Structures are given as structure tokens and as C-alpha cells.
């Protein structure tokens, strides 16, 4: 119950704080760690970091010594600049932006699951949110960002939605839990299961 805990950058402060405030009632030493999406998976699969939790919305179900569970979930929108040419025509669709860049998260050295997979040809790697922003801003290309990212600046006008067709709303995610094998049989870690999945929902109603 000496714990190292992963959450990505997808998953809201909200969220993790809901995590945090669980895994401290349930467990008494609790270490945080934050990565973005793509270098999740990764992370935790590296033995030399000892992750013994990890909440992500990648996944891959050959993980190995980690079973798995979903926690609940997050939204992420498609956003671009006003002045996009897509942003434009009320039309958009999947085949409709491979033309156009994309600023994507991660690297090209690394197995793009699906999930963080660029699904257009003409991209350009970044490895934060804010980097992505700040090209998707300048109008260099279009991206998928989480809500509480990009809430404000698209309220504010600085940036524009896409995905308000395919899913009104915003791009419903699972968010999993990736507990070690061994945290199973622990009754700490099936009771910030229950705790934390009970407090997400009812946050995310709100
Ligand atoms: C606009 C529409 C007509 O076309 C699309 C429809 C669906 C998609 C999705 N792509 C990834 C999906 C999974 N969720 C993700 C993936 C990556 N990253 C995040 C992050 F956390 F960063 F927000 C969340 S859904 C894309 C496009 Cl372009």
C-alpha cells in the first residue's frame, strides 16, 4: 500500500483531485504522476518506474502483470481556429479533415494505438496540450483536445468545435484503471474503486 499512480493530461483536475482525495482515505502513502496520453501506456509498462495504479483513456489489452477496469469518463473535442477553412463549412467529417493538418499528441517513435492515432496524412507531433494549442491558435492545423483545456478559449472565441456533429457534446472517452495484478486481493483498492466511481458520477452529472 506504498502507492505510485499515474493519471494523463486528458483527465480533468477534477477528476484526479477525486482520485487523489479516494487513494489517501484507502491507501496511506500515495505518489503522484502526471504524463500525456501517448507516454502513458508506456510508462507504466517500463518496470523501472513501478507504477502500481494508472488512469489513462489509452488502452491495450495485452497488458502485461496489470488488469484492468474503467473508472468513468471524459469529453475532448475536435477544436481549430475560427478562421479555419473547415471551421467554415458546417459540414465536417472524418474523411473531410484527413485533408487538412493535424496537430497530434505524441511521437513518431512510438505504437500509435488507436486511440492517439492520427487519422489524417499531413500531421505535425507535439508533445503537450499546450504546444497543440498554441499551433491549433496560430492556424497551423486542427486537434483533439480534452474539455477543461479548451473550455475557456473556445467560450472566449479564441477557438472553434468540429465534433458537434459526430458526438453533440464532446467525445465521450472511457477513462480506465490499470491496477497491478497483486492490488486484487487488497480491500483498499476495491473500496477507492467503489469510493472514486460513485464521486466521478456524481461530478460528472453536475
Ligand atoms: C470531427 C469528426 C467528424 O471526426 C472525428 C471523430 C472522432 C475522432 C476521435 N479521435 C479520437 C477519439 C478517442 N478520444 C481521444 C483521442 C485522442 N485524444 C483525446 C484527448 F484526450 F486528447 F482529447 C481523446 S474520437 C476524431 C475525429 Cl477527427
Redesign the pocket.
Known amino acids: 500500500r506504498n502507492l505510485r499512480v499515474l493519471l ?3 483527465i480533468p483536475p477534477s477528476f484526479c483531485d477525486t482520485v487523489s482525495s479516494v487513494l489517501l482515505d484507502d491507501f496511506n502513502m500515495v505518489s503522484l504522476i502526471r504524463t500525456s ?1 501517448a507516454d502513458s501506456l508506456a510508462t507504466i509498462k517500463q518496470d523501472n518506474a513501478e507504477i502500481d495504479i494508472a488512469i489513462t ?1 489509452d488502452e491495450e489489452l495485452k497488458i502485461s502483470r496489470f488488469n484492468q477496469c474503467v473508472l468513468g469518463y ?5 477544436v481549430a481556429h475560427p478562421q479555419h477553412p473547415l471551421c467554415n463549412a458546417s459540414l ?3 474523411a ?2 484527413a485533408n487538412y493538418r ?1 496537430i ?2 505524441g511521437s513518431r517513435s512510438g505504437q500509435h494505438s488507436n ?3 492520427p ?2 496524412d499531413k500531421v505535425l507531433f507535439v508533445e503537450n ?1 499546450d504546444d497543440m494549442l498554441r499551433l491549433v491558435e496560430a492556424g497551423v492545423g ?6 477543461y ?1 479548451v473550455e475557456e478559449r473556445l467560450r472566449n472565441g479564441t477557438l472553434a468545435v ?2 458537434e ?3 453533440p457534446g464532446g ?1 465521450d ?1 472511457k477513462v480506465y484503471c490499470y491496477y497491478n495484478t497483486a492490488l486484487e486481493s487488497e480491500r483498499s483498492f476495491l473500496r477507492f474503486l467503489e469510493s472514486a466511481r460513485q464521486r466521478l458520477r456524481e461530478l460528472g452529472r453536475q
Open positions: 494523463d493530461t486528458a496520453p483513456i471524459t469529453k475532448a473535442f475536435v465536417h467529417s472524418i473531410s479533415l493535424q497530434s499528441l486511440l492517439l492515432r487519422v489524417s496540450f486542427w486537434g483533439i483536445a480534452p474539455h483545456f468540429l465534433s456533429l459526430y458526438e467525445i472517452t
